[PDB]
Amino acid sequence: MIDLIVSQGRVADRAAWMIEGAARTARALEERYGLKGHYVGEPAPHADDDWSVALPQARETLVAVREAATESIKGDNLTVLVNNTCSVSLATLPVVAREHPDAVVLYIDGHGDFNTPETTDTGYLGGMVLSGACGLWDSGHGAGLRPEQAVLVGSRDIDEGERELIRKAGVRVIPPGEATAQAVLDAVKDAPVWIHIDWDVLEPGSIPADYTVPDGMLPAQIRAVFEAIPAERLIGVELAELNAPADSERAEQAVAVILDMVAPAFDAAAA
Ligand SMILES: [Mn+2]
Ligand SMILES: [Mn+2]
What we know:
monomer, alpha/beta, eight-stranded parallel β-sheet, about 40% helix, about 15% strand, globular, binds manganese (II) ion
């Protein structure tokens, strides 16, 4: 009852290993849950190109992800996308909002990803994902997601300009220290739920985390969200931006933490 879709095409990647990180994540879920992913797109080297150039490079991959996610959302399974970058979601979130206008999008991310072409400092498409899906600029892949239905979770240290775009559009923000399971549940109400996770929301690992207050979200906070969202209400889950090299020990240790965080939702969906 899980539909696993994996992006392997470049969508504006500026980091070197997020396509490999996607591949390693999908593999772990394949082995644990007895699935075989639908892989989409052809890998390409990362680059520091303007969104105006990277977005058209990505059209083929984005279109094929849209078709595969659309297929999945209209079915009866849990839709799980393992994405190299958040920018893949320029294709999926408009589908989510059209099939499920009442869906709340939990955009879990250390950043706001709410830049527009006029406000971006870096030109990075990954920083314009939620604003594009909400229609503040036109990505060429649709919009229709109400900002009132989007909730940023774990975001912090947002640029004052971008924080005002977020505020004016009506996107709620729940910082890591407020991001308990109940706070998230209270933001969702009865609605069906789409979960999008950029792993940079996570606190950089501390083994003795005992006496410091973390700035990012902890894995246990991610797991509690997945434990708290009722299975009948979960539309799907996007896992994005694991930057870890193929065959590396680090990728192996990374996907073990991911599988522990996602296990409550995926185990419920599997049976
Ligand atoms: Mn992101
Ligand atoms: Mn981020």
